[PDB]
Amino acid sequence: KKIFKPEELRQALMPTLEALYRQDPESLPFRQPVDPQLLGIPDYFDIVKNPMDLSTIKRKLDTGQYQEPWQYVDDVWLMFNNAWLYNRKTSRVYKFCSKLAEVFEQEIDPVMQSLG
Ligand SMILES: CC(=O)c1ccc(OCCN2CC3(COC3)C2)c(NC(=O)c2cc(NC(=O)c3ccco3)cc(-c3ccn(C)n3)c2)c1
Numbered sequence: 001k002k003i004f005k006p007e008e009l010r011q012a013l014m015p016t017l018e019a020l021y022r023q024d025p026e027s028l029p030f031r032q033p034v035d036p037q038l039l040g041i042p043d044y045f046d047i048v049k050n051p052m053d054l055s056t057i058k059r060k061l062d063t064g065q066y067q068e069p070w071q072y073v074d075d076v077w078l079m080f081n082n083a084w085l086y087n088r089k090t091s092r093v094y095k096f097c098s099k100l101a102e103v104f105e106q107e108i109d110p111v112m113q114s115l116g
Pocket residue numbers: 025028029030032034039041082083086087092093
């Protein structure tokens with residue numbers, strides 16, 4: 001029955017998002033929503049039905065749309081799963097995604113233990 005205030009969640013969780021943003025070049029494919037037309041991948045929305053990216057997740061943190069830490073974590077892993085799904089295993093974005101996933105697991109595990 002534990003209650004999380006929006007600012008309590010933002011303060012605990014926003015550093016883990018900032019850690020993803022700090023990965024350069026690995027975060028560059030993920031800082032804005034995929035634009036299938038600009039990127040030259042017009043089939044993207046045929047395959048990815050629930051797009052997610054760092055900027056969307058940041059706006060949900062900034063607007064209190066997460067009531068529970070796991071809802072935040074779900075959006076981060078939705079972003080990873082999208083990239084692993086759409087992109088080939090040998091591709092730039094897949095490998096960049098795998099790097100972000102490792103960085104995220106490191107940053108989030110101590111925060112989940114302290115939150116709860
Ligand atoms: C999320 C997902 O499933 C997905 C699929 C395919 C994608 O792309 C298709 C390929 N095209 C990207 C290129 C390579 O160059 C453009 C070929 C992307 N998107 C990127 O891969 C990307 C990469 C950089 N850049 C560096 O990865 C990099 C490494 C070293 C130097 O720069 C930037 C950006 C970007 C978009 C807007 N902005 C301001 N920036 C996007 C994302």
